[PDB]
UniProtKB/Swiss-Prot annotation, chain A:
Coiled-coil parts of chain: 62-98
Tissues expressing this chain: Widely expressed. Highly expressed in vascular tissues such as placenta, testis and liver.
Molecular function (Gene Ontology), one example: actin binding
Family of this protein: Belongs to the Mediator complex subunit 28 family.
Subunit structure: Component of the Mediator complex, which is composed of MED1, MED4, MED6, MED7, MED8, MED9, MED10, MED11, MED12, MED13, MED13L, MED14, MED15, MED16, MED17, MED18, MED19, MED20, MED21, MED22, MED23, MED24, MED25, MED26, MED27, MED29, MED30, MED31, CCNC, CDK8 and CDC2L6/CDK11. The MED12, MED13, CCNC and CDK8 subunits form a distinct module termed the CDK8 module. Mediator containing the CDK8 module is less active than Mediator lacking this module in supporting transcriptional activation.
Protein name: Mediator of RNA polymerase II transcription subunit 28
Record localization: Nucleus; Cytoplasm; Membrane
Protein role: Component of the Mediator complex, a coactivator involved in the regulated transcription of nearly all RNA polymerase II-dependent genes. Mediator functions as a bridge to convey information from gene-specific regulatory proteins to the basal RNA polymerase II transcription machinery. Mediator is recruited to promoters by direct interactions with regulatory proteins and serves as a scaffold for the assembly of a functional preinitiation complex with RNA polymerase II and the general transcription factors.
UniProtKB/Swiss-Prot annotation, chain C:
Primary role: Component of the Mediator complex, a coactivator involved in the regulated transcription of nearly all RNA polymerase II-dependent genes. Mediator functions as a bridge to convey information from gene-specific regulatory proteins to the basal RNA polymerase II transcription machinery. Mediator is recruited to promoters by direct interactions with regulatory proteins and serves as a scaffold for the assembly of a functional preinitiation complex with RNA polymerase II and the general transcription factors. Required for cholesterol-dependent gene regulation.
PTM entry text: Ubiquitinated by TRIM11, leading to proteasomal degradation.
Subunit architecture: Component of the Mediator complex, which is composed of MED1, MED4, MED6, MED7, MED8, MED9, MED10, MED11, MED12, MED13, MED13L, MED14, MED15, MED16, MED17, MED18, MED19, MED20, MED21, MED22, MED23, MED24, MED25, MED26, MED27, MED29, MED30, MED31, CCNC, CDK8 and CDC2L6/CDK11. The MED12, MED13, CCNC and CDK8 subunits form a distinct module termed the CDK8 module. Mediator containing the CDK8 module is less active than Mediator lacking this module in supporting transcriptional activation.
Residue window of the full protein shown: 615 to 787 of 788
Species, as recorded: Homo sapiens
Induction text: By 12-O-tetradecanoylphorbol-13-acetate (TPA).
Family: Belongs to the Mediator complex subunit 15 family.
Curated annotation (Swiss-Prot), chain D:
GO function term, MF aspect, one: transcription coregulator activity
Gene: MED29
Protein's name according to its UniProt entry: Mediator of RNA polymerase II transcription subunit 29
Keyword Transcription regulation on entry: yes
Source organism: Homo sapiens (Human)
Subcellular location: Nucleus
Tissue expression pattern: Widely expressed in embryo and adult.
Job of this protein: Component of the Mediator complex, a coactivator involved in the regulated transcription of nearly all RNA polymerase II-dependent genes. Mediator functions as a bridge to convey information from gene-specific regulatory proteins to the basal RNA polymerase II transcription machinery. Mediator is recruited to promoters by direct interactions with regulatory proteins and serves as a scaffold for the assembly of a functional preinitiation complex with RNA polymerase II and the general transcription factors.
UniProtKB/Swiss-Prot annotation, chain G:
Subcellular location: Nucleus
Role, per record: Component of the Mediator complex, a coactivator involved in the regulated transcription of nearly all RNA polymerase II-dependent genes. Mediator functions as a bridge to convey information from gene-specific regulatory proteins to the basal RNA polymerase II transcription machinery. Mediator is recruited to promoters by direct interactions with regulatory proteins and serves as a scaffold for the assembly of a functional preinitiation complex with RNA polymerase II and the general transcription factors.
Name of the protein in question: Mediator of RNA polymerase II transcription subunit 30
The entry's keywords: Acetylation, Activator, Coiled coil, Nucleus, Transcription, Transcription regulation
Gene behind the chain: MED30
A GO MF label: transcription coactivator activity
Family: Belongs to the Mediator complex subunit 30 family.
GO CC term, one of those recorded: ubiquitin ligase complex
Tissue: Expressed in brain, heart, kidney, liver, lung, pancreas, placenta and skeletal muscle.
Length: 102, 200, 156, 115, 391, 263, 126
């Protein structure tokens, strides 16, 4: 029931030992809470991946919009990088033109 | 880098070189899973006549000035990184790795590189996947459906109980073509989610 | 040995006395229960598994034709593979107490004759049974049958 | 003193075990002789119960001594691990109190966010 | 005299011999013959030849080398399984083409386990497939698949009647991949699984008839066939774990706190040894739940005392509390929520003081809160809380 | 001292064991013999269990004798205990959670030279056997000469607070000491294999963001090469082929290994 | 739209565990000025973590309430076994990025040649 609630409860339980009012006890406790949190996190990831697979196999247009946006962002990033490189190149060109003199 | 685009390729040439030596840092990642897919990395030493390769697994190989040798070696390394990607994905997903062989010897005699092999099981028992990639013949994935689920296996009268009708059975193959995602790891993750609990 | 011996000697004296426990019981009931307190608050399964874990090439079944259900378990399985097959029945008699008395294949040469391919598969599979180790399993016979058929294919 | 007491009780504990084993053997032999047909003297006998309680009493005294020594040693090592002395204890208690405030803050926030 | 010796570094003593011969018709070609040699002043043992199946890769050579390196580790495991009278199927090609596996049929039943539990286990073991994995190819994994699980857990383990447990073994660097220690550890884990299946079967049989307080007090959480994690408490916070340690041949219980309401500990860590011995003498879990439900309430009060007061753990339900060095008191917990307190230093026999001595001056305070040392009882778990600070 | 604390903790368990073992001998005797399906079996079972119980009492008593030879205010102690508890708990939790990380991608250099110098000096402070000489002959890219005893002379080539190339050389060999011999070989096959293994360790120890623990682990792994020519193959004898003991030291396990043997 | 909200939900659940790991590391590094910095860092981490809970919750509600018309096919019935203007925009963007990548490859080749030349000259000058 609302795996979000169960993962919240496990994240609370991982803190339920220190936040309260020898080594083996804390050892086994952290083992249990951490492994439970990891399992339920991997399960929520599996649910999200199933939803993605269904939406992609039945509605393959939003993925195309995502590819378009990603390609445009990549092009903008490349343009910005080449602009910065050109600025540095012009700076170093002026610096080298200053030297070499007598 | 331009021709082969599926797994990845990367190169970071060193800052200081010499007149009789140089060095690069080759990395073969995946498109989306950069973090987990960091198992194969190379450090080439381009000498005057020989190229020395130092793999991350402690394997040193002295190549030649010939161009093909390097191409075939990089293709075999990509083929191995392909199965290492499935291994590292089955770790994060929690798919128990049943078997893993870096150089398998069963099957068709393969090309320049030896074939790789992995077989993982679903966390909830019944389902299981197997992957065999190679430089010449690769992407041979087949899912292991459970018995009493295909309904096409010939029954036997020797089986007189219903307890034996739960084992993973008919070994159905899956077409890697006409699939979703974009990278081998995307399709592997989508197939793993398809064979998941479907809690929705 | 040390510090315990007379107790040892005492109990080693008094085994096979019929009244024994009671004497123990009596002298040991009160103090303990005072101190610690009150008391406390058809077909064998191995063959079925071997069948369940076969390769889908085989379709093993029981044998109601010959005299059975008194001695061993007789099986006519099949050969269902893309490679062409040797005569399918290969009747196998798995005796009781499976982890011993390795099963024997009841030979049927008349069907394997009248054909060169069948004679070759018979010869090679028989030789491969000769080279098989002692106490072989059913899966071993099935696999050597398949590989012998394949050898006959590749030879001719 | 704690190590010395542990040394003092160990010979007594060996003696108490010897008597408890010997008394048990005498009692079992007399009870078997009465239960089967075998004449035996009434004698002093010595009760098994009294010996078994004595052994337990010595065991508690030893455990109490060791538990105190272990607690005292653990406290001393921790004290060493953590100019005027009053200001010294003041800054120690201040650090401990601020750590406790951090504890309470993290606890209340992680418990109010969910559950 | 023109031959190459390709030694296998992972599995030693095995040498491939590749000899080259001149072909008569073509003076510009060669023929390769591959032999499988083995060594024990080196002494050869046997020789066999495989003869069936850019141009400088010699595909068949690498293929044969990989095939040998992948197959030979299984031969030692097969020999070790045959030497210990363990009926096992031969090395078979798995359904997914490329593989090797050794599926066991029957295990040696057990030592020290009842016959009916042995039958219940042998009728539930579906498969014992062994497989090889790991870098250098020296890790083994056995996947046991049991059916008809006795009792489920709170986790998502209530699926179809097929529970899959994976047991991994990695032998040392020496003691080559096929050895005795792997199957020995496997048999040890199987024995522990059987000795735990004893208790799980007892608990599954006793589940229909429960005193109706332990049912709400305790709940089963996970069952991985090698550990039993029961959880008890009013808010289901505390947890006890059952496991059989084959090294010591005794049950090992581990206590923890998993729940968003509890003290600073499981509150039962002061009676851990007596509970260990109690479960070791009589392996029954319902008695454990009962004694835990009976002793938790007094323990929650006896744990909060200032640590002056010293807690000496005696036998179960007999926790002892002592003063700095001259006073004592015995805590006798019983069913129906009652605790009987005693004078302490007093002796249950002839009136002489113990080593601690110093007869408690009062003792009538305990009377109004609930010679003259016989029995002070009838505290209904509230006196057990107030009388702490009062005394 | 800590050794005394452990001896007391072991002794407390030994007293508990002696009391439990003595109770077991008497408690089992009270139950007495069980049927066992056979006359011989029942007699043998009772004798075996009693003898094991009697022996356990002797073993537990012996340990206690042997262990004798070896050995506003309360809130402060509460704070100390909670600090120790949080330290242990957070350490275990961080270990267990960074061992298994679910991060799959990043998308959802410039560094001060004095900072690199400080990091190198901090690393040189520990490992007193190793001596690292900082030098910048060519640009901000630093070159480190690391002397390990009379054994090794490693040439690390930093491009940033990052390890790029390593060439170990022998102690008697000349690094030329001046404008640094970055490009050369050791002329001995053992040191060449050690250079290969050092490049392998570099490719292995690669943390994504933090550039300090990588150098820490590299220096720690190099320090393991101080027992070279003196330690076994833990699978092989001292000279497996003729390369020395361990051209290889396992990462996560500073054990010697021959490259020909494995790892 | 929904297929991107699902990727957002994926990245949120992939990042929450990393945030908890960073919180654990911060509590571990907290041994007894700097205390104020550690406290405010922990508080900011907790606030961003609660914000991540809210975000993952809302995207969960969104993907659950969406349930588009095209979902009658259950899972395992979708995997393929053996036995318009958007595409034009994709092709145009592909051609553009291909040209830009060829130009960037030329630039990288020139830069590598420059660096190799400078290194060789500054090495041989000695």
């Amino acid at each position: 029931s609302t795996l979000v609630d169960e993962l919240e409860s496990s994240f609370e339980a991982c803190f339920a030992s220190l936040v309260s009012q020898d080594q083996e006890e804390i050892r086994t406790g952290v083992d249990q809470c951490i492994q439970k949190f990891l399992d339920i996190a991997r399960q929520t990831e599996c649910f999200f991946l199933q939803k993605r697979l269904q939406l992609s196999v039945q509605k393959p247009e939003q993925v195309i919009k995502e590819d378009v946006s990603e390609l445009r962002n990549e092009l903008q990033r490349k343009d910005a990088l080449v602009q910065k490189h050109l600025t540095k190149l012009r700076h170093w060109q002026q610096v080298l033109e200053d030297i070499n003199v007598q | 880098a331009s021709r082969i685009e599926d797994p990845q390729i990367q190169a970071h040439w060193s800052n200081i070189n010499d007149v009789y030596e140089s060095s690069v840092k080759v990395l073969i990642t995946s498109q989306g899973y950069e973090q987990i897919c960091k198992s194969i990395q190379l450090q080439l030493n381009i000498g005057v006549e020989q190229i020395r390769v130092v793999h991350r697994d402690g394997r040193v190989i002295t190549l030649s000035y010939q161009e093909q040798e390097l191409q075939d070696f990089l293709l075999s390394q990509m083929s191995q990184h392909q199965v290492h990607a499935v291994q590292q994905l089955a770790k994060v997903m929690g798919w128990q790795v049943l078997s893993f062989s870096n150089h398998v010897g069963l099957g068709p005699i393969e090309s320049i590189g030896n074939a790789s092999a992995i077989t993982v099981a679903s966390p909830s028992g019944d389902y299981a996947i197997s992957v065999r990639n190679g430089p010449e013949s690769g992407s041979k994935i087949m899912v292991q459906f459970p018995r009493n689920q295909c309904k096409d296996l010939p029954k036997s009268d020797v089986l007189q109980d219903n307890k034996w009708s739960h084992l993973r059975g008919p070994f159905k193959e899956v077409q890697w073509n006409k699939m979703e995602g974009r990278n081998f790891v995307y399709k592997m993750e989508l197939l793993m989610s398809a064979l998941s609990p479907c809690l929705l | 040995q040390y510090l315990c011996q007379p107790l040892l000697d005492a109990v080693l004296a008094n085994i096979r006395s019929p009244v024994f426990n009671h004497s123990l019981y009596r002298t040991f009931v009160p103090a303990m229960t005072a101190i610690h307190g009150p008391p406390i608050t058809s077909i064998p399964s191995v063959l079925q598994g071997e069948v369940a874990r076969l390769d889908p090439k085989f379709l093993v079944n029981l044998d109601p034709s010959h005299c059975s259900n008194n001695g061993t378990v007789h099986l006519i399985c099949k050969l269902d593979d893309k490679d062409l097959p040797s005569v399918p029945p290969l009747e196998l008699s798995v005796p009781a107490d499976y982890p011993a008395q390795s099963p024997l294949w009841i030979d049927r040469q008349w069907q394997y004759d009248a054909n060169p391919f069948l004679q070759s598969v018979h010869r090679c599979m028989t030789s491969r049974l000769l080279q098989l180790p002692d106490k072989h399993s059913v899966t071993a016979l099935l696999n050597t049958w398949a590989q012998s058929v394949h050898q006959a294919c590749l030879s001719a | 003193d704690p190590v010395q007491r542990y040394k003092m009780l160990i010979p007594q504990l060996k003696e108490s075990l010897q008597t408890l084993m010997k008394v048990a053997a005498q009692n079992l032999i007399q009870n078997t002789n009465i239960d089967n047909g075998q004449k035996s003297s009434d004698g002093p006998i010595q009760r098994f119960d009294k010996c078994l309680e004595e052994f337990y009493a010595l065991c508690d005294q030893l455990e109490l001594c060791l538990r105190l020594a272990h607690e005292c040693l653990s406290q001393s090592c921790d004290s060493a691990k953590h100019l005027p002395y009053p200001q010294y204890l003041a800054v120690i208690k201040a650090q401990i109190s601020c750590a406790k405030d951090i504890h309470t803050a993290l606890l209340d926030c992680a418990n109010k966010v969910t559950g | 005299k023109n031959k190459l010796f390709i030694k296998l570094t992972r599995l030693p003593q095995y040498y491939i011999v590749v000899e080259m011969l001149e072909v008569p018709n073509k003076p510009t070609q060669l023929s390769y013959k591959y032999y499988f040699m083995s060594v024990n002043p080196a002494m050869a043992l046997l020789l066999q030849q495989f003869k069936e199946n850019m141009c400088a890769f010699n595909k068949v050579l690498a293929h044969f080398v990989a095939m040998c390196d992948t197959n030979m580790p299984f031969v030692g495991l097969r020999l070790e399984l045959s030497n210990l009278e363990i009926p096992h199927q031969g090395v078979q090609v798995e359904g997914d083409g490329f593989s090797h596996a050794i599926r066991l049929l029957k295990i040696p039943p057990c030592k020290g386990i009842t016959e009916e539990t042995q039958k219940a286990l042998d009728r539930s073991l579906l498969d014992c497939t062994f497989r090889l994995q790991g870098r250098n190819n020296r890790t083994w994994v056995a996947e046991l698949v049991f059916a008809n699980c006795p009792l489920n857990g709170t986790s998502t383990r209530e699926q179809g009647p097929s529970r899959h447990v994976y047991l991994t073994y990695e032998n040392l660097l020496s003691e080559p991949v096929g050895g005795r220690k792997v199957v020995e550890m496997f048999l040890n884990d199987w024995n522990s699984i059987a000795r735990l299946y004893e208790c799980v079967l007892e608990f599954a049989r006793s589940l229909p008839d429960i005193p109706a307080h332990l049912n709400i007090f305790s709940e089963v959480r996970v069952y991985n066939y090698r550990k039993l994690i029961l959880c008890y408490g009013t808010t289901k916070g505390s947890s006890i774990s059952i496991q059989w340690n084959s090294i010591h041949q005794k049950f090992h219980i581990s206590l923890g706190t998993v729940g968003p309401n509890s003290g600073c500990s499981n509150c039962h860590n002061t009676i851990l040894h007596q509970l260990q011995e109690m479960f070791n003498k009589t392996p029954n879990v319902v008695q454990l739940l009962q004694v835990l439900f009976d002793t938790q309430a007094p323990l929650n009060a006896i744990n909060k005392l200032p640590t002056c007061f010293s807690i000496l753990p005696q036998s179960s339900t007999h926790i002892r509390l002592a003063f700095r060095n001259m006073y004592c008191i015995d805590i006798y917990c019983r069913s129906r929520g009652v605790v009987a307190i005693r004078d302490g230093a007093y002796s249950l026999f002839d009136n002489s003081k113990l080593v601690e001595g110093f007869y408690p001056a009062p003792g009538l305070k305990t009377f109004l809160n609930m010679p003259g040392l016989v029995p002070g009882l009838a505290g209904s778990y509230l006196c057990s809380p107030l009388e702490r600070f009062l005394g | 001292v800590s050794v005394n604390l452990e001896a007391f903790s072991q002794a407390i368990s030994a007293i508990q064991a002696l009391r439990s073992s003595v109770s077991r001998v008497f408690d089992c005797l009270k139950d007495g013999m069980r049927n066992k399906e056979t006359l011989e079996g029942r007699e043998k079972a009772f004798i075996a269990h009693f003898q094991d119980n009697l022996h356990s009492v002797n073993r537990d008593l012996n340990e206690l004798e042997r262990l004798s030879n070896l050995v506003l205010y309360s809130q402060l102690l509460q704070a100390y205990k909670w600090s120790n508890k949080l330290q242990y708990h957070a350490g275990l939790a961080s270990g267990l959670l960074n061992q298994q990380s679910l991060k799959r991608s990043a998308n959802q250099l410039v560094l001060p030279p004095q900072y690199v110098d400080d990091v190198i000096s901090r690393i040189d402070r520990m490992f007193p056997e190793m001596s690292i000489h900082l030098s910048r002959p060519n640009g901000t890219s630093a070159m480190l000469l690391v002397t390990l005893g009379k054994v090794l002379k490693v040439i690390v080539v930093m491009r940033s607070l990052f390890i790029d190339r390593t060439i170990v050389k022998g102690y008697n060999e000349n690094v030329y000491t001046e404008d640094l011999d970055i490009w050369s070989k050791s002329n001995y096959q053992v040191f060449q294999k050690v250079t290969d293994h050092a490049t392998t360790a570099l490719l292995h120890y690669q943390l994504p963001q933090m550039p300090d623990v990588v150098v820490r682990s590299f220096m720690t792994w190099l320090r393991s090469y101080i027992k070279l020519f003196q330690a076994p193959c833990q699978r092989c004898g001292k000279f497996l082929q003729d390369g020395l003991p361990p051209t290889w030291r396992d990462f996560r396990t500073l054990e010697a290994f021959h490259d020909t043997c494995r790892q | 739209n929904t297929a991107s909200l699902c990727r957002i939900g994926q990245e949120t659940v992939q990042d929450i565990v990393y945030r908890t790991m960073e919180i654990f590391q911060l509590l571990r590094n907290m041994q007894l000025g700097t205390y104020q910095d550690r406290l405010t860092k922990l508080q900011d981490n907790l606030r961003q973590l609660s914000v991540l809970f809210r975000k993952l919750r809302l995207v969960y509600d969104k993907c659950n309430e969406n349930c588009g018309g095209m979902d009658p096919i259950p899972v395992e019935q979708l995997i393929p076994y053996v036995e318009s203007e958007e595409r034009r925009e994709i092709a145009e963007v592909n051609k553009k990025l291909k040209q830009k990548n060829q130009q960037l490859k030329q630039i990288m080749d020139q830069l590598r040649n420059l660096i190799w030349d400078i290194n060789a000259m500054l090495a041989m000058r000695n």
